[PDB]
Sequence to fold (103 residues):
Amino acid sequence: WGSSYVNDFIDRGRVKRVYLQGRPDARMNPDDLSKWYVRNDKGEMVPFNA
Amino acid sequence: NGQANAMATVQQLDPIYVDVTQPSTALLRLRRELASGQLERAGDNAAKVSLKL
Fold:
């Protein structure tokens, strides 16, 4: 959600930024908060609403 | 005789099991709202399931 700016890259001889964020379909409503998963220590994905 | 690793595998592609998952808190709130409050009334087409790739 927070759109983390990760590093820089070159474009047409100019230094520009590169960002990282989920797609717009995945962050619009609170139940879309349940659509994201995290990997536990054992290696499986657990949903965010768990 | 009785080794762990196999030599080959045979599979039946028709039909296909689809094992899906859902969190237990979602099942809990669905079971709570299914009885308390408004009745969800699952009905006849509760068996119907369609998937996307």
Residues 13 and 30 of chain A are 41 Å apart (CA to CA). The first strand of chain A starts at residue 4 and ends at 11.
